[PDB]
């Protein structure tokens, strides 16, 4: 109720406390949102993929192919956040495995 809602605001306020961020950001409040769902309890890798593509395929005003012959179109909105090292060769053969869930 109200006693638990005021505690969630403090979690988002203290989330950007170590990152040296002044104003709060929407990407920091959703971090504690997942802990509230799993509070009463390689599968974690498959969770951050479904929750990411759902927020992208809901803003295109048009629709092209990007079905079977254009499997590399779904890699554009995800390579922007990639800025490490091993997420280019090792994770290259992993993209074709997650997309197989819709094919079957």
């Amino acid at each position: 109720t109200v006693r638990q809602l005021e505690s969630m605001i403090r979690l988002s306020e203290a989330m950007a406390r170590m990152h040296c961020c002044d104003e709060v950001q929407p990407k920091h409040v959703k971090e504690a949102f997942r802990l509230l769902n799993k509070s009463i309890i390689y599968c974690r890798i498959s969770n951050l993929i479904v929750l990411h593509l759902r927020k992208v395929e809901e803003e295109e005003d048009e629709s092209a192919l990007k079905r079977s012959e254009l499997v590399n179109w779904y890699l554009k909105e995800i390579e922007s956040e990639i800025d490490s090292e091993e997420e280019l060769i090792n994770k290259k053969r992993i993209i074709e495995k997650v997309i197989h869930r819709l094919t079957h």
Binding site: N72, L75, E79, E85, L88, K92
Partner: protein, 32 residues
Amino acid sequence: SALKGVSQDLLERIRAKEAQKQLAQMTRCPEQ
């Protein structure tokens, strides 16, 4: 994409720049 699509070199020198500075800091020495 990256290998078969576009960005053949734009997303290639990112790891090369990070791997170049790591080979220059090997003489950092732990006790220093």
